[PDB]
Amino acid sequence: KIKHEHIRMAMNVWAHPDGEKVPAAKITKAYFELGMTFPELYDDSHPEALARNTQKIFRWLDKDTPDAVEKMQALLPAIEKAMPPLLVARMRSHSSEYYREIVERRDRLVKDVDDFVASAVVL
Amino acid sequence: KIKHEHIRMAMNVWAHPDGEKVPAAKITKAYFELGMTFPELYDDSHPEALARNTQKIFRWLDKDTPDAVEKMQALLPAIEKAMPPLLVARMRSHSSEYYREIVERRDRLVKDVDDFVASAVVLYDQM
Amino acid sequence: KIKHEHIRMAMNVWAHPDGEKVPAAKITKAYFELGMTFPELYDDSHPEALARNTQKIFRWLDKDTPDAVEKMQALLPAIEKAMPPLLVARMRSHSSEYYREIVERRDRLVKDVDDFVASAVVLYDQ
Amino acid sequence: SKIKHEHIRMAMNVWAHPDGEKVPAAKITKAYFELGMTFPELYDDSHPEALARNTQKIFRWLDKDTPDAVEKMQALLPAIEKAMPPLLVARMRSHSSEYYREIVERRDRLVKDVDDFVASAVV
Ligand SMILES: [Cl-]
Ligand SMILES: [Cl-]
């Protein structure tokens, strides 16, 4: 139900501030916490797990083959546990009316903020 | 700039939670901090100063004579220095489009926040 | 779930602006709307129900006897149905990490909001 | 030249980003004539491709670094400020004015305040 493209969108927004290694690291940590096995991610005994897990995760995210689409679907439990809750909600907003409402409320509030700050501005 | 009638409104909202003695006291504190003398408000050397100041301030607030209006106008420096800044903006909103837009935009943001708190409470009780 | 003393805190803040009769009144409508029997509150047929109900509700809130806690625990469905939602969240925050966090972040945003207004009203002195 | 050319460009590009350059050009042109301005040259209400020609001119200067380009944008500032969204004006000026830096900082904190709040509600 969560379309491959929306995982990709949310994942890129998550990677933009500090790069993919941050999302990759947190996804892996939650992946092992959930005792998962598919898709394959290198545990910490590999000295280059992170660079490898990063390259992997974003190759699948950027491909549109059925194998890659499936692998990201399997990873959803780990992404959701690890993603910032506000970003999970955007990811979910295209398939869940609740979360769509959540982001609309978030968006409404910051528009409230911007209009407010602007009214204070002089010049 | 601030019409007498607008001090009255903001002053009544200020007094409703805890009474008039609270605004009067805060007004007096700023009155003296600002080294004022007109109109006259009693320092602590006069008996029942707060009660007498309170009765004074709010008598001027409810009357509409040029004297009542004049004394309230002299008091503005103390009132605004003493009042919650948000309340000053509400007071000024009837005479300044700047502040009207700010209070109006502030109120919408806070209502929109609190409504969301409401939606979360409902999520529980549903569940 | 809600400890008796925390119902009391929330109840007094509700009573602070306009008195005890206001919350009592809102509680009375919700108790009947919610069809309750314990505790006992006087219907509209008593000409001094509201005052007596007001004294009733707030005796239990101010007492700590085993009886009073039991009566106040039953009234919570009415209190929560009638109380300002923000105040229920404050009330629930003493027992719910969810609400502790929600209320906290709410209070910070609004405090930052009001502070901004303070800085603009000050800069008016220009 | 307190406001560096590069910051007018940054601020101008975000303004143009949602709906294109014609919106900023149009709103800027309106303020230019309202202010009875004459330098740099912007075509009055009467020329043919005025908006498109005005759009290209305004954004040619923004993208050049020559002395004439810098000066024409500096001269245009009074119109840009009358027309630009106030929140962006503060952003544009924040590197040269402590007031606007403070505005922009207070704003960004409020938006994080919001995001923390919605996140806390999301669970
Ligand atoms: Cl709307
Ligand atoms: Cl021509």
Numbering used by the authors:
A (entry chain A): 2 to 124
B (entry chain B): 2 to 128
C (entry chain D): 2 to 127
D (entry chain C): 1 to 123
Quoted passage from the original study:
YdaT is a functional equivalent of the CII repressor in certain lambdoid phages and prophages. YdaT from the cryptic prophage CP-933P in the genome of Escherichia coli O157:H7 is functional as a DNA-binding protein and recognizes a 5′-TTGATTN6AATCAA-3′ inverted repeat. The DNA-binding domain is a helix–turn–helix (HTH)-containing POU domain and is followed by a long α-helix (α6) that forms an antiparallel four-helix bundle, creating a tetramer. CP-933P YdaT is a representative of a family of transcription regulators found in lambdoid phages and is functionally but not structurally related to λ CII.
The crystal contained a tetramer in the asymmetric unit. The final structure was built for residues Lys2–Leu124. The N-terminal His tag as well as the C-terminal residues Tyr125–His141 are disordered and do not provide interpretable electron density. A long (14-residue) loop between helices α2 and α3 making up the HTH motif is unique to YdaT and is absent from all other POU-domain structures. The long C-terminal α-helix α6 serves as an oligomerization motif, with four such helices assembling into an antiparallel bundle, burying a total surface of around 2600 Å2. A hydrophobic core is formed via the side chains of Ile103, Leu110, Val111, Val114, Phe117, Val118 and Ala121. The loop Ser94–Tyr99 here serves as a hinge region.
